[PDB]
Amino acid sequence: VQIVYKPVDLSKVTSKCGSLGNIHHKPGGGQVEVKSEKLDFKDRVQSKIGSLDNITHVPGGGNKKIETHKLTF
Amino acid sequence: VQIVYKPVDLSKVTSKCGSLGNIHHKPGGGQVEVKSEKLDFKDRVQSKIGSLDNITHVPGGGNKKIETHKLTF
Amino acid sequence: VQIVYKPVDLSKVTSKCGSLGNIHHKPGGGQVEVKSEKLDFKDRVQSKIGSLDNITHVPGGGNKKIETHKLTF
Amino acid sequence: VQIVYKPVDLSKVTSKCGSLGNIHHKPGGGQVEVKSEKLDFKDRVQSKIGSLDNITHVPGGGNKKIETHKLTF
Amino acid sequence: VQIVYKPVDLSKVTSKCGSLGNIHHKPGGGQVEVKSEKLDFKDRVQSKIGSLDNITHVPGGGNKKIETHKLTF
Amino acid sequence: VQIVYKPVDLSKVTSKCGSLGNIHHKPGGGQVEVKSEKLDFKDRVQSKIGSLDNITHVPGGGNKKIETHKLTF
What we know:
Chains A, B, C, D, E, F: The record marks 6, 12, 16, 26, 35, 38, 65, 70 as: Not glycated. By secondary structure, the first copy, chain A, is mainly beta.
């Protein structure tokens, strides 16, 4: 057994923008009500309960590069 | 047994923006109401309960590079 | 037994922004209410309960590079 | 010439209620945008422009008695 | 010329309620914008512009009696 | 010329309420924005511009009696 792991990457995940703006985000309020008796959360739970969240997200470039490199024996 | 791990990366996640602005985030309030008896959370739980959260996030470049490199026997 | 781990990175996660500004964040209040009897949290819990949080986040470059390098037997 | 004006009133505008309640008014927000250039008003105008009004009105008795008594020559 | 004006009133506008309550008024916020250039007003105008008004009005008896009595020559 | 003006009133605008309470008024914020160049007002104007007003009004008896008695020549 010989193993060689040698991937090569020269990629561009690039963006170009001339001018970014005039972005208006005017939410109008709202209402949320949640009822329960018991919550029981185990092992890697992610939760929102009862949320009224407003987000403006304006990256001048929002580029994502995501990788997994893996071996197993 | 022999193993070699030499992955190579020369990548660009780069951005260019000429001018960024005139961004207006103006939430209108809101109402949130949550009821329960018992909350019981175990092992790596992430939780929001009853939130009214406002975010303006304007990164002049918001580029993300995420990598996992991993051997395992 | 022989193992060589020698990954190589010459990458750029850079940004350029020509001018950043004219950002307005004007929240409008709100109301939040939460009820319970018992909270019981064990092992690596992250929690918000009852929040009314406003965030302005304007990094002139907000680039993030995240790496995990690992071996295990 | 003799004029006699003599209304007689012995009326009941009465109400009876045994128990009044469990009234829930839960408005869900909203949005309004009014545009105009020139507004000009004269003589006994009542006006409302661009409104998001919420009213709960729970009189334990909500009776009205309204009269005009008038002579003219 | 002889004129007599003798209205007679023995009227009841009376109310009775046994118990008044459990009233919940819970507005969800909201958003209003009004744009204009020139406003000009003369002689007995009543005006409201750009409002987000919340009213709970719970009179234990809310009775009205309104009268105009008039002579004119 | 003979005039007699002599109205008689023995009226009751009275109320009874046995118990008054458990009233909750919980506004959720809001947002208001008014724009203009020139405001100009003459003679008996009542005006409200750009309001976010919250009113709880709980009179244990809230009765009104309004009378106008008038002569003119």
